[PDB]
């Protein structure tokens, strides 16, 4: 959607070294802890009282694995990003009724998590790149509405 050669590759560069069974769950988890009102959407998952309860929830990390799947996916289809999420758009839009601002939120915490594991490999030029991806991914899901 704008990624220039290096960015294009740089983004994909890290993504390979990404422990798929960790990051997904950790991102979905922190979101529920830092922004409490998003818990309203996941009653069925059970106990989300203490931050540990959240982080130690099988369903939470099991579902989180599905969210990164969506990024890995759209990350491979930057051209038609505004159409890869067409269904998840309709879903989160008129099925679950989630305010779009919330998409922005999850986008940023993912950044926090990536920067968490890749310590010093996560440079400003990298963050800047990933910020664009994250932005398109969110912009896509809200497309159903507008």
């Amino acid at each position: 959607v704008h990624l220039t050669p290096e960015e294009k590759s740089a983004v994909t560069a890290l993504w390979g070294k990404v422990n798929v069974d960790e990051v997904g769950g950790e991102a979905l988890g922190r979101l529920l802890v830092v922004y409490p009102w998003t818990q309203r959407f996941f009653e069925s998952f059970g106990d989300l009282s203490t931050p540990d309860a959240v982080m130690g929830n099988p369903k939470v990390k099991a579902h989180g694995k599905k969210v990164l799947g969506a990024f890995s996916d759209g990350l491979a289809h930057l051209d038609n990003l505004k159409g890869t999420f067409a269904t998840l758009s309709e879903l989160h839009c008129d099925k679950l009724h989630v305010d779009p601002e919330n998409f922005r939120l999850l986008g940023n915490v993912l950044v926090c998590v990536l920067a968490h594991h890749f310590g010093k490999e996560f440079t400003p030029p990298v963050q800047a790149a990933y910020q664009k991806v994250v932005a398109g991914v969110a912009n896509a899901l809200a497309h159903k509405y507008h």
């Binding site: 830092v34 931050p51 926090c112 920067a115 310590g119 400003p124 030029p125 963050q127 910020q131």
Partner: protein, 141 residues
């Protein structure tokens, strides 16, 4: 609001920074200008290269401010009221920007203190930086 634990966690982690505070400050600044380019409009005269001393220098200016606010936590509208007039009435900065500097301030603290950045801490520094922003945009509400 900042419950007790909040202001407690904040201290510990911000304590774990120390001499790095200045460094982290500039890093945050750089990360912002790069990711959200629109923000550069407020610093025209500036040299924004990688080494830039203005940035390196302004990076400490901001760091110290957060430190001071960490200190006088139980009373920020007084300790920061000088900056309010500057950022709000003199410069008239768009509120949204404050959101962008907070995000980058967190991205940095989790790349240098992965041992400290836990969901519980992460959650506290957000509430904190949140307040500090309100305080700075005080004369808008």
């Amino acid at each position: 609001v900042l419950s007790p634990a909040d202001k407690t966690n904040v201290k510990a982690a911000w304590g774990k920074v120390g001499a790095h505070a200045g460094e982290y400050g500039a890093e945050a600044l750089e990360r912002m200008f790069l990711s959200f380019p629109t923000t550069k409009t407020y610093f025209p005269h500036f040299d924004l290269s990688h080494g830039s001393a203005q940035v390196k220098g302004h990076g400490k200016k901001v760091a110290d401010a957060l430190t001071n606010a960490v200190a006088h936590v139980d009373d920020m509208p007084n300790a920061l009221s000088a900056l309010s007039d500057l950022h709000a009435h003199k410069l008239r900065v768009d509120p949204v920007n404050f959101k962008l500097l907070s995000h980058c301030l967190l991205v940095t603290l989790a790349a240098h203190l992965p041992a400290e950045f836990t969901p519980a801490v992460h959650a506290s520094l957000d509430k904190f930086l949140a307040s500090v922003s309100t305080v700075l945009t005080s004369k808008y509400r």
